[PDB]
Every structure is written in structure tokens, then in C-alpha cells.
Design a protein around this ligand. Sequence first.
Ligand SMILES: [Mg+2]
Ligand SMILES: [Mg+2]
Ligand SMILES: [Mg+2]
Ligand SMILES: [Mg+2]
Ligand SMILES: [Mg+2]
Ligand SMILES: [Mg+2]
Ligand SMILES: [Mg+2]
Ligand SMILES: [Mg+2]
Ligand SMILES: [Mg+2]
Ligand SMILES: [Mg+2]
Ligand SMILES: [Mg+2]
Ligand SMILES: [Mg+2]
Ligand SMILES: [Mg+2]
Ligand SMILES: [Mg+2]
Ligand SMILES: [Mg+2]
Ligand SMILES: [Mg+2]
Ligand SMILES: [Mg+2]
Ligand SMILES: [Mg+2]
Ligand SMILES: [Mg+2]
Ligand SMILES: [Mg+2]
Ligand SMILES: [Mg+2]
Ligand SMILES: [Mg+2]
Ligand SMILES: [Mg+2]
Ligand SMILES: [Mg+2]
Ligand SMILES: [Mg+2]
Ligand SMILES: [Mg+2]
Ligand SMILES: [Mg+2]
Ligand SMILES: [Mg+2]
Ligand SMILES: [Mg+2]
Ligand SMILES: [Mg+2]
Ligand SMILES: [Mg+2]
Ligand SMILES: [Mg+2]
Ligand SMILES: [Mg+2]
Ligand SMILES: [Mg+2]
Ligand SMILES: [Mg+2]
Ligand SMILES: [Mg+2]
Ligand SMILES: [Mg+2]
Ligand SMILES: [Mg+2]
Ligand SMILES: [Zn+2]
Ligand SMILES: [Zn+2]
Lengths: 201, 98, 63, 25, 91, 127, 214
Amino acid sequence: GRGAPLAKVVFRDPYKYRLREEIFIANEGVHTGQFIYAGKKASLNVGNVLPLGSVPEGTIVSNVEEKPGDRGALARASGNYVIIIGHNPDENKTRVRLPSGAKKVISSDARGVIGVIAGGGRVDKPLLKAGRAFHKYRLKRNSWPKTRGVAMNPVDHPHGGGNHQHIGKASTISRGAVSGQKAGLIAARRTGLLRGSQKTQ
Amino acid sequence: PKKRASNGRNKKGRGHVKPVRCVNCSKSIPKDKAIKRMAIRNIVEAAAVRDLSEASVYPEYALPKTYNKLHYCVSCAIHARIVRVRSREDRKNRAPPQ
Amino acid sequence: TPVTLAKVIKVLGRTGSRGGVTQVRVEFLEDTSRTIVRNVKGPVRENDILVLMESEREARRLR
Amino acid sequence: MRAKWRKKRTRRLKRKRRKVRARSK
Amino acid sequence: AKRTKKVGITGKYGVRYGSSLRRQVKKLEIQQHARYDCSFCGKKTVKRGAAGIWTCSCCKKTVAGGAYTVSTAAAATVRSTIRRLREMVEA
Amino acid sequence: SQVFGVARIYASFNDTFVHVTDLSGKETIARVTGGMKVKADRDESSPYAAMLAAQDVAAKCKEVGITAVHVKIRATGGTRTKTPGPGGQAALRALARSGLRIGRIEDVTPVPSDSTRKKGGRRGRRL
Amino acid sequence: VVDPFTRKEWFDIKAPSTFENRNVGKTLVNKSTGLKSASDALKGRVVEVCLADLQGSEDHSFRKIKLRVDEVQGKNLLTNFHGMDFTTDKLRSMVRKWQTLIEANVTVKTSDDYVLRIFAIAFTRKQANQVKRHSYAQSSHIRAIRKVISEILTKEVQGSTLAQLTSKLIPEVINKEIENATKDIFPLQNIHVRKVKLLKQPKFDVGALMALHG
RNA sequence: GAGGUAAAAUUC
RNA sequence: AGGUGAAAUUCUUGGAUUUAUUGAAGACUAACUACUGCGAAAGCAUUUGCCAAGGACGUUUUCAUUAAUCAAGAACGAAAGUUAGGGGAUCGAAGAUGAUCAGAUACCGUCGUAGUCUUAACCAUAAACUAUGCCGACUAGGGAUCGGGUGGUGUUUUUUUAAUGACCCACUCGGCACCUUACGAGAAAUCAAAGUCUUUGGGUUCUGGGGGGAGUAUGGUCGCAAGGCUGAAACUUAAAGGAAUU
Ligand SMILES: [Mg+2]
Ligand SMILES: [Mg+2]
Ligand SMILES: [Mg+2]
Ligand SMILES: [Mg+2]
Ligand SMILES: [Mg+2]
Ligand SMILES: [Mg+2]
Ligand SMILES: [Mg+2]
Ligand SMILES: [Mg+2]
Ligand SMILES: [Mg+2]
Ligand SMILES: [Mg+2]
Ligand SMILES: [Mg+2]
Ligand SMILES: [Mg+2]
Ligand SMILES: [Mg+2]
Ligand SMILES: [Mg+2]
Ligand SMILES: [Mg+2]
Ligand SMILES: [Mg+2]
Ligand SMILES: [Mg+2]
Ligand SMILES: [Mg+2]
Ligand SMILES: [Mg+2]
Ligand SMILES: [Mg+2]
Ligand SMILES: [Mg+2]
Ligand SMILES: [Mg+2]
Ligand SMILES: [Mg+2]
Ligand SMILES: [Mg+2]
Ligand SMILES: [Mg+2]
Ligand SMILES: [Mg+2]
Ligand SMILES: [Mg+2]
Ligand SMILES: [Mg+2]
Ligand SMILES: [Mg+2]
Ligand SMILES: [Mg+2]
Ligand SMILES: [Mg+2]
Ligand SMILES: [Mg+2]
Ligand SMILES: [Mg+2]
Ligand SMILES: [Mg+2]
Ligand SMILES: [Mg+2]
Ligand SMILES: [Mg+2]
Ligand SMILES: [Mg+2]
Ligand SMILES: [Mg+2]
Ligand SMILES: [Zn+2]
Ligand SMILES: [Zn+2]
């Protein structure tokens, strides 16, 4: 269910003699037996997790946290990364660049592992047959196949019905609608083929 | 026929150097093909230097000069009276006219 | 409106498309150390006192 | 006429001709 | 003896699946099933495990990498970046 | 004895901007353009409309108290004709005679290491 | 409709004590009322003024100093050094035809945490009794001259403060030290300190600003 | 060493 | 306010245009830039580092002719265009509008995709022109310049005289070139090469045989496509074309 491989990075408990084994997300370039460092005073090497208040600008990191304590929220899929584009010494803020392109500022006390996540180029191969789409999606949920709502009955989808295959009304349904109406393009600011740019954010 | 020697420019064994843009009509042209006029001027005119010496609060002051290098294409250096068509024997004169 | 007089000290020549505008460098009678070239219309000799409606105006070449 | 727009005249002549030839094979 | 003219490895699929799709699959199955070099033992004994797992046949080493290659072009500019920044910390 | 300011005469084609500002540059006082004085939309770069625009600025500086000024001639610059218009020499002469005190004339035309390809096409503008 | 000029209040400019003739000019700031008062409206305003007025001499009429406002006390603001920039008419009189232009840059921090980038322009000098006109460089001395320049520029800076660097640019002491270590390489002329701008200020140390005014 | 400048105008 | 020869479209107390403080984004490398450099060509102008490559010069070093030119074939090959990602500030084929005009699908004005940028592949044509194959020898004078080297009763920088570097003079190679000439060559324009050619043989590769129809038809091959390469006939005409003078 994940394009990225895991990692059995095992730690030691500093308060009782045992071996606590944890599961990370494997970056690209790590290997079995690498000394993975975890701390604020740790060095800046690929595979180590560091707080964002102790790294300079431009460090390509991943598995960055929103708030310090949620054990890894943002940038977890295969082949993704965020870019620290600026710091703030006052009130310990750190401005990062999310993979969607959303420049959002977070706390400097949040953590993040150095480097891009292993598994890049996964969606660059044409997943040709439906059998490869079957064995992919049967390990996730019951969301495959996807029947077109025009082809089904008027009781089954708001677009279906009629003597032809047509929607009938506008596919742009507002955000302030209720369930049962939210089909097609939910609250679209723009529609049609992208013949412009990425001017804002 | 071949009325000239380099025939358009000052390129001697290079093939291609640099394209530049004209200032009068925004025409793309090679740098050695576009003629050059280092049109050096004073920042004030000859008639505005009398009233500026009376309005100056400075005892002595050095007059600035606006230096600029601007290029012309062939089509907008002949319509504007910059260069003129010459006789067949006087093409070879490469000295600046005084 | 104020009136400003000017005496002709030097004449340049005819400048225009049809040839009816003369470039004349006049010198003011209230200031004997400052001159402004003006464009006139009619027959102008030297040492003629003209009446200028606008005091400060630099004359260009008409085309 | 100009030797470039006679060339493009024969160029679109080729695309129109081999398209009729390809739909009869 | 080169038997197929241009399809090579994607000739297993046959006539189906289009032309421009199987050309892109051929690009990511030559690199996928390739025998790569190991950074540790030096021998060309690297076999692909799962999607992202790159094991080695000798010395039993396993390096996490890309989905269809060992080191993609995205991580090639990451490691060169950390090489530059680490020299400024120690100097 | 003399309070100072900067004038920043933007002498482009088909308009002349004259607005005297302070030494910090934040505050602007007495903005008069060339198009305000003539109802033609042709003589906006004329030397006549630039002298009436410059004397309107200096008639308001007498009300404020600005007696001296550090004028700054400026063309359009960038990827443009980078040459001051006809109303630039007219603006320097007008506000100097009107009563102001001129100090340190200079030029602030923006001239880059050229980029951002110049408007007009490759083969050029023509008529 | 009301005139805003009664609302505006005059505030004089007082330059620091790295030179003479402190009085620069006056500004116009609105009265100290509520809704973004005058004290918060003077948090940084550069004043691009040439140093030919504060020095008196006219041989330095091509060097402009930026003065950023930092502290206001008793209807009187205090300022600090922000940057140095040459006038545009001087560089155009520097650059001539038939000579080689050499520019060099370096990023260097002072004794305190002032991150500033200085620029250095230097040209080739046409030697006496020379027949040829251009006297171009060998285009490998330029790599060697700018190695000497970038060593001297990181010697005056990173060996002194900003006030020891501000009061040194006016007697052109750096420009003489470049000439004293380049004449064994190539004959140069017109060595200058063309730009310097501050990239980051460290703190709100009042004791370094009040020590420059008294 | 600097010194003005673009309307339209097709055929026998 | 924008704009043009003149205009209108457009933006404007929603306070535009302008002014200052910054910040982000890509692109490009002005002035210096030169009858100047390098590369087989296309081409290549910010700094520094790394990685290799090359010409010229110097050489009382080496191998011993290992060479010269080139069907088939291979590498590279501006721009535009194609496929898949990232970028997408300007400019901007299509297109929409504003004028001009008898008409204006245009020139001009404004806005704006594809494209311009980059990675990974393709395509591989240009007025890809110096419209001038390459190798070798000989024939004529002159002033410059680039790169290397050798001589000076040299100049300057100098700490104590130096040594270098820069510069000057003289000479010699390898350059990009230029000027004056015609013994020579050409139909002439012109050319140190297009010269040493009826007093027509240095080695060698390619192309052309009146103008059209044809760079078309068909066949083969290459390419994802647009296309590239190879390439006629029927028929028709007696002129087409070059240089120069009035
Ligand atoms: Mg994942
Ligand atoms: Mg699903
Ligand atoms: Mg199902
Ligand atoms: Mg579906
Ligand atoms: Mg579907
Ligand atoms: Mg479906
Ligand atoms: Mg049904
Ligand atoms: Mg229906
Ligand atoms: Mg349908
Ligand atoms: Mg409905
Ligand atoms: Mg969009
Ligand atoms: Mg001709
Ligand atoms: Mg070429
Ligand atoms: Mg015909
Ligand atoms: Mg059919
Ligand atoms: Mg257009
Ligand atoms: Mg014309
Ligand atoms: Mg440059
Ligand atoms: Mg061949
Ligand atoms: Mg290309
Ligand atoms: Mg774009
Ligand atoms: Mg159109
Ligand atoms: Mg119309
Ligand atoms: Mg159309
Ligand atoms: Mg149009
Ligand atoms: Mg060809
Ligand atoms: Mg050519
Ligand atoms: Mg040819
Ligand atoms: Mg000779
Ligand atoms: Mg001869
Ligand atoms: Mg024939
Ligand atoms: Mg052919
Ligand atoms: Mg064919
Ligand atoms: Mg065929
Ligand atoms: Mg393809
Ligand atoms: Mg074909
Ligand atoms: Mg025939
Ligand atoms: Mg004739
Ligand atoms: Zn032009
Ligand atoms: Zn191994």
C-alpha cells in the first residue's frame, strides 16, 4: 500500500535495558547497517533526522512534522521532499516549501529526516493491463473499478439518465452544497485544460 | 553580385558571434553588423547652462555627461540621417568624416 | 498678461517646410546678458524690438 | 512567385495526396 | 543472434498495449532488470528486490533506492548538495 | 539655511513626470504631469507642457518651504529606448528659473545587463 | 478636503560621527497620534546622498552614502551606515574603448556579524612611450590580479569593525593597497570600491549606535 | 567633442 | 495613466501611473566587445573550483614513413518541430480585439497560449555562405595585431643592485586579416588568390551538361509524426541566366 520501502531502524531505551525497534520510511541512499543518528546536535548527513531549527536554508529533507510530537506527518510518499526556504530567529518559525507548491511556515522544533524518499519514478511507468491495476488496488481498498456516473441509473448518480450519455447540468457543484450533490468538480475555481501557468503559490 | 568584401559585418572567420537588438525599431541584428554611435552628450543643453549657474548653490561644480552606447540596424540608419549611400569608389574609405 | 520685449541681435535663416518661418536669436531688453532663439514669421531685420507673449520658450526646427 | 511559398504549396500537396492514398489501401 | 528487430524485452506483450506505451515500458524494464554495480563490494552483483529495494548477491548488502534504478536523477543533486553544505560546516 | 529634496524628473516618451520627494524618498509632494496641462494627448512630451508642469511644482514648494532640490533626470530604461524625451531639458530649465536652487544634477536611468527580450519581434517594428 | 501638510511634522537628519557636517536635511512625518504613530513609521528610511557635502571637498562628488534611520529621540532621529554606491555618470566616464575591464566581488563578514558584499573595479593603464593603443590584458593575469584583490579585501574586512571600515573608504586607503601589490603583475588604473551593501544586521545593540553619536 | 524623425497612394 | 504618424481598445478614490522599503520567480550575461580570440563545424562572453581534451611555440628526445585524399558507414550538427517530467519572468507562430483601408483574415496598438528555459530521448534540414573541397610546392611589396620563442649600449616598477611583469626596438615561426598594385587570371565585377591553364598533366574526392515540368511521380529506406535521403518519364519552349554600360 506504500510505494516507499520501510526500515527496521532499531534503537535502545535509555531508561531500561531493552531494544525498542521502530519503523521509519527509507530514504534513497541508505543501506542496512548505516548508523542513523537522531537528535538536535547530530550532524547533517543523509538518513539522519534533525530538527528544522538546526539546519540551514536549502536542505532537501523529508518526513517533516507539522507540530513537534506527531511523529511524522508531511512528505511521506515515495520520491517526495520539502525545501526549507527561510528561517525566523524570533518565535522559532521555519518557512518550508511543500511538494504541492504551498509555501507554509511551521515551527523550528519540528523534526525531519535528511534526503529524498526512496521509490521515485514509480508513476513514470505505464501500468498497462487492468490486472496490474487489480493487484495494486486490492491491497489498498475496494475503490476499483470506477463506473462512470453517466452510464448508471438516475437513482445511482445525479448525472445518469436520459436517452443519451450526457451530464445535463454543470459539473461544478459549490462547496456549500450538501452530500448527494457533490459530484464531478467540487467547488472548482477554474475548469478546462490548463493553458496558463502556476502564477499564484 | 558581391559588391563588398565581408559583405555585411566585421566577422573574419567565426561563423556566428552575438545577436543584438536595435534601439529605433527593435530589430534583431548581429553585433558587428549593426553600426555603432557612441552618442556622448552633456546632461544639460547649451542654452540651459546659463540659468543653471545662477541657480546653483555650489561655488564650482563639474558638469555631468550622459554616456550611452546604442546600435542601429541598416534600415533605420539610412532613413534617419546617420549614414548615406556613397559612390562606388568612396565605399572603401573607412575613416570617420570630420 | 505681462509683456516682454526682445531685441534682434543675430538672425540664423529660414527653417520650415514651405519657407516662411525664420530662426532669430533675440536678446531681451530687461536682461542684456541672456538670449533665447525664437521662431518668427514675418520680415525681421537686426536691431528690431519684438513683443514676446511667452518669455521662456526654446525654439526648435520645424519640419 | 516566391520559391518558399511554392515549396510549401507542394508540401501541403504531399500531405493531402498521400492521405487519399492511405485510405484506399 | 538478434531475433526481434526493435521491441526487445517488451515483445513479451505481443501486438497489444499500443506502441508508445510499450516504448516507455521498455525504457523502464531495461533499467529495472539490469545487473548493477555495488558501492560496497565493487562487484556487479546487484539484483532488484521489491519496488525500492536493491539487494546484492554477495556480502548480503541491501541499499534502498529508486523504483526502477539504483540512483535516480532526483537524488543525484541531493547528495551533491549535502557534499557542498558539509564542507562549509567543517570549515 | 537651505532645506533639500530630490525631484526625480522621469522624462519618457509621450509623458513627463515631475514630483519632488524628500531625501528619504517615501513622501511625495506636488505631483504634476505633462498631460494635465494640455488637452491634446499629443504634446504630453512637448517642451511647452513640461515647463508648465515644472512651474506648477515649484509654485507649491514655496507654500511648503522647499527652497532647494536635487533633480534627477530619468529615461524609461530597461528594455526600452533608454533616451530622455524632449521634456527633460525643458523641465530642468523651468524650475531652475522659477526660484528653486539646483544642486548635484545626475542621471538615474535603469540600464541592466540586458535580458527579458525586447518588445517588437525579431525582424523589427515597421511602418 | 483638507491639506495634509499641517498634519506633517518636520524631522531633521543627523549623520553619525565618521565625518564632519552632520546636518543633511529634513523629512516630513505625520504627527505622533494613534493608528501607526510616527515612531513606527521611521523604522528604516534610506537617504541616498553624496558625501561631497559632508566632506566639503569636490574631489569626492561620485560617492553616495545610504543612511538608514534607526532611533528617534526628542524630535530628532539618529541614523546609521546602510550602503555605499557610486553615481551613474562616473562609471560611464570610467569605461572607455580599447581597454580591458576587470571586476571582482567577494562575500566577507566583519569583526561583528555584518554580512556585506564589496565590489572592486579596476582598469588597465596605457603605459608611457607605448606605440600600440589598446594595451589589453593577457586574460590570465585577470585571474591572478583578482586573486590578489580578493586577498586584500578580506584583510581590511575581517580585521576591523564597520566604523573602522567606514572611516577608511574616504581616504581611499584600500585603493592604495591594491596598487601596491599589483604593479609587479600588470600596470593598472582606476581602482575603486564601487559598491557595498549590508545583507543582515545581527541585533538591537543600542550601545553601538549611541557610541557613534555621543 | 552633441544639434530631429515615419498618415493613406490600387490597376492600364 | 498606457499608446501611436494621429488614435481608440485597456487600466483608474476599488485611489492607478509614479516614489521608497523589501521579498519571490525564472531568464539573460549590457557597457568593457576590438577589420580581435578559440573550436572540425553548428557554435562559444558573470565568478571560482573540479574533471579531461587541443593548437601554436620551444627541443642536439623518440618511433621510422607509420602518409595524402576519400564510395559504403559512423560521431557531431543553429533555429523550428515531436514524446515524457520539471519550470513557465519576459517576448510571443495560432487566436481574440482597437484603428488604418474601397475591402485589411495584414503592417501598427493591446492581451495571450504553443514555444522560448532545463532533464531524458528523437528529428537532423538553413543564404549550415568565405555562395570559393582538402593536402603539397612556388610566385610581391607594405603597415598593423594575436600566441610562443630568441637578441637588446633599452624604458618603467625597486627594498640595496637585482630577478620577473608591463612596454619599446630588431628578428623569426603559427594565426584572423588588411592595404597598395597586375607580371599573371577572368565574360566582367573582381582575385595573393579564383595565379603559376592551348607556351593547355603535383596527388586526390564530389557535383553540373539550355530553360521548364521535378526536387514532382513511383519504388526502396530512415523517422513517433512533420519529414530526410535516393530519384525519373510523358509533354512544352527557344530562350532562360551572369557581369557591365547608357
Ligand atoms: Mg510513502
Ligand atoms: Mg483506491
Ligand atoms: Mg470492486
Ligand atoms: Mg473513470
Ligand atoms: Mg479511470
Ligand atoms: Mg471508468
Ligand atoms: Mg443503463
Ligand atoms: Mg443523466
Ligand atoms: Mg457523452
Ligand atoms: Mg443537480
Ligand atoms: Mg493554472
Ligand atoms: Mg543588388
Ligand atoms: Mg552561420
Ligand atoms: Mg506558370
Ligand atoms: Mg475506411
Ligand atoms: Mg503582434
Ligand atoms: Mg519603409
Ligand atoms: Mg558581463
Ligand atoms: Mg558519404
Ligand atoms: Mg535545437
Ligand atoms: Mg510561458
Ligand atoms: Mg492574428
Ligand atoms: Mg477589422
Ligand atoms: Mg484568422
Ligand atoms: Mg495584429
Ligand atoms: Mg543541403
Ligand atoms: Mg555570410
Ligand atoms: Mg552549397
Ligand atoms: Mg606577403
Ligand atoms: Mg599577377
Ligand atoms: Mg538540361
Ligand atoms: Mg536530392
Ligand atoms: Mg518518395
Ligand atoms: Mg515513396
Ligand atoms: Mg515518438
Ligand atoms: Mg516517406
Ligand atoms: Mg527538354
Ligand atoms: Mg544603371
Ligand atoms: Zn532600427
Ligand atoms: Zn555487494
